[PDB]
Amino acid sequence: TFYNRKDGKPFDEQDEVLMESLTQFLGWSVLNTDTYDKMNKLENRKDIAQDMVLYHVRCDREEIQLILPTRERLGKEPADCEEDELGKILKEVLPGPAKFDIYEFHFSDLECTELELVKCGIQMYYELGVVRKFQIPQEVLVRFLFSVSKGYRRITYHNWRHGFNVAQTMFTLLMTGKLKSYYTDLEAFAMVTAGLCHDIDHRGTNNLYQMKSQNPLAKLHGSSILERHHLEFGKFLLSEETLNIYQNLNRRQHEHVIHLMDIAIIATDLALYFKKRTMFQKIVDESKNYEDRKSWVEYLSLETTRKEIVMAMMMTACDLSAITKPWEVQSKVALLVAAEFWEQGDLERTVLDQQPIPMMDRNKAAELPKLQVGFIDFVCTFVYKEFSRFHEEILPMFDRLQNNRKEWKALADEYEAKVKALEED
Amino acid sequence: FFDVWPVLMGEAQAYSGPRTPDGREILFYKVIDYILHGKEDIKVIPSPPADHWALAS
Amino acid sequence: DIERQFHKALYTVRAFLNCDRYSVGLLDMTKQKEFFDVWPVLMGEAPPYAG
Amino acid sequence: RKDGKPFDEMDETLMESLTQFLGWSVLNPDTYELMNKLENRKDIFQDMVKYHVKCDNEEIQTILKTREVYGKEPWECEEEELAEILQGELPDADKYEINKFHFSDLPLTELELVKCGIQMYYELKVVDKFHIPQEALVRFMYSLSKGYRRITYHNWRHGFNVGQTMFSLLVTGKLKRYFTDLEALAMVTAAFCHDIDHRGTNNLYQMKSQNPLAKLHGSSILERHHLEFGKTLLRDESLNIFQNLNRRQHEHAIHMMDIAIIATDLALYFKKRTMFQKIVDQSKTYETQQEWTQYMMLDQTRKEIVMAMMMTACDLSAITKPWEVQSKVALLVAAEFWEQGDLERTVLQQNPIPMMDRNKADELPKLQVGFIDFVCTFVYKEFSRFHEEITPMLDGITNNRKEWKALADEYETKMKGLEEEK
Ligand SMILES: CCCc1nc(C)c2c(=O)nc(-c3cc(S(=O)(=O)N4CCN(CC)CC4)ccc3OCC)[nH]n12
Ligand SMILES: CCCc1nc(C)c2c(=O)nc(-c3cc(S(=O)(=O)N4CCN(CC)CC4)ccc3OCC)[nH]n12
Ligand SMILES: [Mg+2]
Ligand SMILES: [Mg+2]
Ligand SMILES: [Zn+2]
Ligand SMILES: [Zn+2]
């Protein structure tokens, strides 16, 4: 309502148009004031869902009592303790460095329960010699590597055992292949930690089914759909009190490790490896012409770009190490992987109504020895040969890989001979 | 639901005032007024009384 | 999206702008690229931008 | 330009204003991207919680034992052999006295309560009439079992006792006459999930700390959350027990469940008491007639006012138990208040209410005779006139009250004696 003009004259035709265009514009402008409320409700719903997720993947008061058995030796709860008091309890409960031989290349895990692996994992964080230097509180360490344990799903292959095996292989490379010389302690902390969270919430289907099924994952991200989902969940986990093992670091170191973790996690996508594989061979060749081993250290430990290309290759050399183990574990891991492949094939044929490809067809389960052979020639045989020419301590991996290839090819030949024999009549 | 019960049980009376052409009830919950002679005196009212110098007419 | 909004706001005012032809071009807003695209430059391939 | 003459000032200002407006109007296309990212992130995080509160393929072999007897997976069986396989698993309604007012679940494991909740549906004769499947029912019960938290009081043990009491009212108190079978099913299945995913704090602590719950909803913050989560659970295939209902019946069941769940809030009970007190009194004027029967069950407002009172009498049923159970339950219910006191003392730096701080640990009995006098003595009185068969509950409270009173007086003397002589 407008109540009086200043000239003295009454309102007329022009004033109605002038004061009606304004109200038409302001009436049309309420779209933004509606969108505002819609966004303010979506945000709250997302926060509530995040909290409900967080509750189910943490350690309650009665769950950590299975690892550090306080409340019996002392009257106080884990939270009301002194740092040196908990060390005495932790020393006597954790397994020794030489009980489970975690310093070898042949460590098999299927002879231990799912609770032992957590204690071995937190032992590894003491072997590096990193808890004292940065002063990470010792309750947070246990709670974190128990939450990560409960974070994985429960499926055939991509479960907690794979996540522990990758980290163990990376630790073995760091402390037995002597690749520790090129990196400082801070750049190994964030590699061993980033080895435990590389497949943290795997559904059980590769990146192609995600695009062919219009999962909400395929619209949020555009390239390397799954590998970017494992990173934000991990950074959400280690971003809260009682699980933040990075709180005692200062600003620069925290920024450095957070920048160094995403490269390691995203580098596990096989497609990126094929494209940026040549650049590693040039570094390998440049290493040769130098005079001595020691001099090469002082050159490599300074250039930054060249170290990242080596880390992003150690991550792939670790992610598929299950092919280099003795022929008592490979014969089972192969079938474990085949199970997941057949399950994805069944889902493809049942839901979206297409024909699965020969790789994922449950019927033709007799040509498995053949396909595997091709895999060894297609992807594995390069990463390991290059690392063998780089350092000399990583040769057993290569010879065991050769032996496994021989075995698989022998089985494939036998199967093909039987098939040809059956067709004679 | 807990507001339509008293009406259906004889506790209160149905509405009898004016209605907006799409059925809603007419009640103002804010009134912004400007004075531009002498003083700027901008004002906001959280709930207008029954007799404001604008709604009274 | 931006492309539709400009193509609905410029089509309605043909008459008021008495001109024969007019055109609009849209730039790209990507400041910093990923890590796996910078590497080929810092290692001696694909010489840097010059424009 | 279409006149043959060059551009000048008056054609610069016009096209400068046009481009200024177009430049300002780029706010809208960005919010489109922000919306289309927020929605997808919400969908991902809401699908992550459905894996943790659902019964997977294993751990359902602890009730339906199909592998050992048949050798095939549950989804391959028929409607028969499944009723047969679960016939011998479920308990018997007589041995455990499922439909009495004195049922106590202290010496029972959590797995048995699931198999009693499954039996309750068979007792009402609802499975066959509406053709609900079996696997869906069993998965639903086990999922509700896993959906509660592990806090001291509001756990699954409180979610079973508030459904058993309503079953007992609908079968032993003979309140089933007013309701059809569909409404009975809806009420029984909305009594189990009335307090689901309860954090452990009342509605004031949600407003003080500005939790995200306090912003999305405006009044009765926690009940709307319970309802929304329950309905989200009910809308998943392999967990949906409403697969074989037409649109009308499904809508009616959802509406009844909605009205039932939000009526268990104490702030809506103090204002809707006189209406019930009048509905009870007008029932006597149909004298010498047990055939009034809610005007032959044609009225609809009264059938929706009786249900709310039934829910708010089932919720507080713990006070009407024998003394040897109430004595143990009172400490559990006090522990949560004591725990909330510490959080609101430390996080907000505020002095707690005397019922919350541990320092009045000896003042517990006194408060327990205020509550009984204030909130939960009216309801069990009025029902006692509405029907007579639910009299044994009205006695219960009275007995309990007496005991509490005596205890309080003793404490008083202890406090009275020491102060005077000192
Ligand atoms: C993504 C699978 C990673 C993997 N880890 C292990 C230990 C194994 C293994 O033993 N065998 C296979 C494996 C790999 C192929 S492949 O060479 O066709 N391969 C090409 C690359 N693409 C990229 C998405 C995948 C398919 C075929 C069959 C395979 O195993 C069948 C059990 N894959 N595999
Ligand atoms: C949690 C409240 C509902 C409840 N269920 C049971 C079985 C019990 C019980 O035994 N005792 C109490 C209970 C109730 C009160 S109260 O009367 O002060 N009360 C007023 C209403 N407000 C909410 C609007 C809550 C506080 C005080 C103390 C109580 O228990 C102390 C052990 N409450 N209670
Ligand atoms: Mg992966
Ligand atoms: Mg409640
Ligand atoms: Zn992996
Ligand atoms: Zn309750």
Range of the domain at D180: 74-409
Residue D217 is assigned to a ligand binding site: no
3-class DSSP state of B43: strand
**Chain centroid to CA A33:** 41
Q: Tell me how far apart the alpha carbons of residues D186 and D258 are, in angstroms, rounded to a whole number.
A: 10
Q: Between the CA of residue B43 and those of B32, B35, B51, D258, D371, what are the distances in Å?
A: 6, 9, 16, 43, 47
Q: How far apart are CA D305 and CA A388, in angstroms?
A: 80
From A106, A158, A254, A391, active-site residue: A158
Token pair in block for residue A423: 């067709």
**With an 8 Å Cβ cutoff, are A309 and C42 in contact?**
no
- Measured in Å, residue A198 CA sits from the centre of ligand 3 at 7
Q: What residues make up the domain containing A155?
A: 64-419
Annotated binding-site residues of A for a divalent metal cation read: 162, 198-199, 319
Q: Collect all residues with Cβ–Cβ distance below 8 Å to A34 and sequence separation of at least 6.
A: none
C42: closest CA among A366, A276, A98?
A: A276
Resolution (A): 3.2
Tokens encoding A276: 């940026």
Q: Which sign, positive or negative, has the C-alpha torsion A258, A263, A267, A272?
A: positive
Residues A189 and A167 sit within 8 Å (Cβ to Cβ): no
Longest dimension (CA), chain C: 56
CB contact under 8 A, B9 and D275: yes
Nearest to A268 by CA among A307, A229, A303, A315: A315
Is A202 in the active site?
no
Q: What is the distance between the alpha carbons of residues D101 and D393, in angstroms, rounded to a whole number? A: 7
Q: How far apart are CA A85 and CA D74, in angstroms?
A: 52
Q: What is the sign, positive or negative, of the torsion defined by CA atoms of A126, A131, A132, A133?
A: positive
Show residues of chain A in contact with C36, CB under 8 Å: 272, 275-276
SS3 assignment, position A58: coil
Copy the structure tokens of residue A158.
């991509």
Q: Is C27 on the interface with D (CB under 8 A)?
A: no
Residues of chain D found within 8 Å of residue A232, distances taken between Cβ atoms: none
Q: CA of A235: how far to CAs of A46, A230, A255, A262, D302, in Å?
A: 17, 9, 13, 10, 54
CA angle A254, A255, A259 (to 5 degrees): 115
Q: Is A248 on the interface with D (CB under 8 A)?
A: no
Chain centre distance of CA A17:
64
Q: Residue D257 CA to chain centroid, in angstroms?
A: 10
Structural tokens at position D322: 């024998």
**Rounded to an integer, what distance in angstroms lies between the CA atom of residue A116 and that of residue A130?**
21
Contact D193, D226 (CB under 8 A): yes
Given an 8 Å threshold on Cβ–Cβ distance, is D35 in contact with A41?
no
- For residue D241 and ligand 2, the question of a CB distance below 6 A is answered with no
- B5 and D268 within 8 Å at the Cβ level: the answer is no
Cα C22 versus chain centre, distance: 17
Q: Do the annotations mark residue D315 as ligand-binding?
A: yes
Contact A279 C39 (CB under 8 A): yes
CA-nearest residue to B6 within chain D is D275
Going by alpha carbons, the residue nearest to atom 24 of ligand 1 is A270
Residue A211, Cβ neighbours under 10 Å: how many?
12
Ligand 1 neighbour A375 (Cβ under 6 A)? yes
CB A279 within 8 A of CB C39: yes
Q: CA dist A313 to A106, D181, D365, Å? A: 21, 66, 69
- CA D361, CA A31: separation in Å to the nearest integer? 56
Instruction: Write the DSSP symbol of residue A224.
Output: S
- How far apart CA A260 and CA D393 sit, in angstroms, is 67
CATH number, domain containing residue A181:
1.10.1300.10
Cβ-nearest to C35 among A263, A279, A282: A263
Question: Solved by what technique?
Answer: cryo-EM
Nearest 5°: the CA angle B35, B40, B41 is 75
What does the alpha-carbon distance between residue A405 and residue A326 come to, in Å, rounded to a whole number? Answer: 12
Q: Which of A174, A171, A169, A116 is nearest to A145 (CA)?
A: A116
Whether the CB-CB separation of A16 and D16 falls below 8 Å is answered with: no
Tokens at A411, concatenated = 């089985």
Q: What angle do CA D294, D310, D148 make, to 5 degrees?
A: 145
Q: Tell me, what CATH number does D194's domain have?
A: 1.10.1300.10
Q: Which two tokens stand for residue A123?
A: 């032992």
Q: What is the CA radius of gyration of chain C?
A: 19
CB A185 within 8 A of CB A142: no
Cβ within 8 Å, pair D275-B8: no
C-alpha A168: how far from its chain's center?
13
Contact call for residues D265 and D370 (beta carbons, < 8 A): no
Closest CA to A417 of A365, A370, A372, A373: A370
Report the SS3 class of residue B32: strand
Q: For tokens 């659902």, name the residue.
A: D54
**Cβ atoms within 10 Å of A166's Cβ, excluding its own:** 23
Say how many CA atoms lie within 13 Å of D204 toward its Cβ.
Answer: 9
Cα(D74)–Cα(D116) distance, rounded to whole angstroms? Answer: 21
CB-CB contact of B30 with B46 (8 Å): yes
Q: Which of A347, A144, A161 is nearest to A242 (CA)?
A: A144
Q: Where are the alpha helices (DSSP H) in A196-329?
A: 207-213, 217-220, 229-237, 251-266, 270-275, 278-289, 293-300, 304-319
Contacts of A224 (CB under 8 A, 6+ apart): A207, A266, A269, A271, A272
Q: Which numbered atom of ligand 1 lies nearest the CA of A271?
A: 23
DSSP conformational letter for A177: S
Q: Is the CB of D368 under 6 A from ligand 2?
A: yes
Ligand nearest to the CA of A337: 1
**D41 vs A48, A153, A220: nearest CB:** A220
3-state helix, strand, coil in chain B (%, to 5): 10, 15, 75
Any ligand 1 atom below 6 A from CB of A296: no
**What one-character DSSP code corresponds to residue B25?**
B
Query: Amino acid identity, residue D317?
Result: S
> From CA A195, how far away is CA A169, in angstroms rounded?
9
Classify residue A196 as left (phi > 0), alpha (psi -120 to 50) or beta.
alpha
Site to probe by mutation for ligand 2, drawn from D194, D333, D403 as the one with most ligand atoms within 8 Å of Cβ, is: D333
Q: Chain A closest CA to C33's CA: distance in Å?
A: 14
Read off the tokens for A18. 């002038």
In three-state form (DSSP H/G/I as H, E/B as E, the rest C), the secondary structure along chain D is CCCCCCCCHHHHHHHHHHHHHHHHCCHHHHHHHHHHHHHHHHHHHHHHHHHHCCCCCCCCCCCCCHHHHCCCCHHHCCCCCHHHHHHCCCCCCCCCCCCCCCCCCCCCCHHHHHHHHHHHHHHCCCHHHHCCCHHHHHHHHHHHHHHCCCCCCCCHHHHHHHHHHHHHHHHCCCCHHHCCHHHHHHHHHHHCCCCCCCCCCCHHHHHHCCCCHHHHCCCCHHHHHHHHHHHHHHCCCCCCCCCCCCHHHHHHHHHHHHHHHCCCCHHHCCCCCHHHHHHHHHCCCCCCCCCCHHHHHCCCHHHHHHHHHHHHHHHCHHHHCCHHHHHHHHHHHHHHHHHHHHHHHHCCCCCCCCCCCHHHHHHHHHHHHHHHHHCCCHHHHHHHHHCCCCHHHHHHHHHHHHHHHHHHHHHHHHHHHHHHHC
What CA–CA distance (Å, rounded) separates A15 from A23? 13
Q: Do C36 and A279 touch (CB under 8 A)?
A: no
Which of D167, D156, D142, D150 has the alpha carbon at shortest distance from D194?
Answer: D156
- CA R_g for chain B: 17
Q: What phi and psi values does residue D175 have, to the nearest 5 degrees?
A: -95, 5
Instruction: List the chains bordering chain B where 3 or more Cβ pairs fall under 8 Å.
Output: D
Q: Work out the burial of residue D320: count CB atoms within 10 Å of its CB; fewer than 13 is exposed, 13-18 middle, 19 or more buried.
A: buried
Locate tokens 């939270």: which residue?
A: A79
Is-contact A71 D236, C-beta < 8 A?
Answer: no
Q: Number of residue pairs across C and D with CB atoms under 8 Å?
A: 20
Residues facing residue B33 across a β-bridge:
B43
Phi (first) and psi of residue D355, to 5 degrees: -80, -5
Tokens, residue A328:
């008592």
The residue in chain A having the minimum alpha-carbon distance to the alpha carbon of residue C42 is A305
Residue (of D253, D244, D242, D206) closest to D348 by Cα position: D206
**Residue labelled with tokens 């009495």:** D100
- Which residue type sits at D231? K
d(CA D146, CA D60): 13
Q: In chain A, what residues touch C39 (CB-CB under 8 Å)? A: 276, 279, 305, 308-309
Determine whether the shortest distance from the Cβ of A337 to ligand 1 is under 6 A. yes
Q: Is D294 left (phi over 0), alpha (psi -120 to 50) or beta?
A: left
Phi, psi of B31 (to 5 degrees): -145, 115
